[model samples]
Target: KGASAYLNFHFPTRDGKDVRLVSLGLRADDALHMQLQEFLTVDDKGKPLSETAYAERCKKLVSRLIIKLGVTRSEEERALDL
Candidate 1:
């Protein structure tokens, strides 16, 4: 019944490397999530991509996450220390 819980999604690379993504604001009882595919980038031989463009791509990913996981801000999690 609480949001702002930590949820981890593990992605293992073909070369045995692993990347773990930890996100907040997901309820523990929720069971729906989409597995993300591998991210791509241009090599030294390929053309470079702008930082702004890459940031936009990240925004799209988060947007999809908010929709698919039913994520909402937790009022009780973030509070003033006073």
Candidate 2:
């Protein structure tokens, strides 16, 4: 048996457009890492971020991206629901 992992999501843009994206599970860690590296500080003042602060901010960042990008369930998932 083979284990499977996927990061499938939908993103809707302006002009009422939408797109579907898919990726391996590892991509999640990589994407999170990149986001953390970009915004892992307090007020962007170049100060060290505490573990708690980092975790909280990281969560907000991810949530913001998901909402801002208009991410939604995949078509396959929607079909299953129907």
Candidate 3:
């Protein structure tokens, strides 16, 4: 079963408002990989991640993308909350 792998936002500039936070499922890895390469690191099984390390993989992944993609954080935004 697919699990919520990422807690993120999808703010498409097209709408110009209402940034929506998305809880991504395991199934989204492929597309997310295209958008965020090496963000969500995988296992030999090609399945979703399980947090066995200290980096908090999903958050770090998003954080890297946010920096690389030049995401602007709100006042409430915290580094780990990425």
Candidate 4:
């Protein structure tokens, strides 16, 4: 829904309704989002990540997020919800 979000996802919330979540991007135009974007893009050395490295990092970020969102679910199981 926003320029700063390259990806969107949903998390199960209390009412069994899914809540939207978004991935960080360099164009984040607000305070919290800008910080989050920077966090996602930076390396251990605090330098910017290369494009391919950033893709890998984003993949890992999503993998970690899904686990945090819910421990286990098949791709089909999750896709149905979407």
Candidate 5:
């Protein structure tokens, strides 16, 4: 028996661009892996990551991606702020 999990997130830039981030959740092992573009296993300091930490890291990475892509909410959407 073999199975795996996957998830993908999509973002639309204000300049008309599309960005995709993918995640792989393995059942065989911790067995989960992720990458917006780069597969992350260890931190910059070269230490392994836990589930929450890893997930949070991915969140920050996505935030950075949004910053880099300049994805902005429209004026009409301003009422709803983060």
Candidate 6:
């Protein structure tokens, strides 16, 4: 087996039921992070950005989630199938 991988996660909702979100090959790399960083707003000194700008800038990366974690389904009918 060459470069095998997997993903598993869990969360508890307000109703107290365990919500499990799992997948395969869910991951990222320095290249993606570097690309995401390009949208961030920093001060003249290159310090941490303001929270408003922080959240706003971070939102730009949401599409990457669609690309990496979004469902790749068709008439086959699947949920969260990358």
Whole-model Cα lDDT per candidate?
0.49, 0.61, 0.54, 0.67, 0.60, 0.55
- Name the weakest run of 10 consecutive residues (lDDT summed) in model 6: 1-10
Which portions of model 6 miss their true places by more than 4 Å?
1-29, 37-45, 63-82
Tens-digit per-residue lDDT, 20-79, candidate 3: 656544445477544443444555356655666324764565565743347788777755
Q: Give the TM-score of candidate 3.
A: 0.26
Distance from true location, Cα of 23 in model 6, Å: 12
Backbone clash count, each prediction separately: 0, 0, 0, 0, 0, 0
Model 6 score (lDDT): 0.55
lDDT of 6 at 24: 40
User: Which prediction has the highest TM-score against the true structure?
Assistant: 4
lDDT of 4 by residue, 35-64 (tens): 657656787788998998888876776676
Question: In model 5, which regions exceed 4 Å deviation?
Answer: 1-39, 67-82
Order of candidate numbers by lDDT, starting with the best: 4, 2, 5, 6, 3, 1
**Candidate 2 lDDT over residue span 6-61, tens digit each:** 43456687869977765435333586644445565554776778889877876775
Between candidates 2 and 4, name the one with more favorable lDDT: 4
Models 1 onward score TM values of: 0.28, 0.32, 0.26, 0.37, 0.32, 0.32
Off by over 4 Å in 2: 1-36, 41-43, 67-82
What is the lDDT, from 0 to 100, of the residue 20 in candidate 3? Answer: 69
In model 1, where do residues sit more than 4 Å from their true spots? 1-46, 66-82
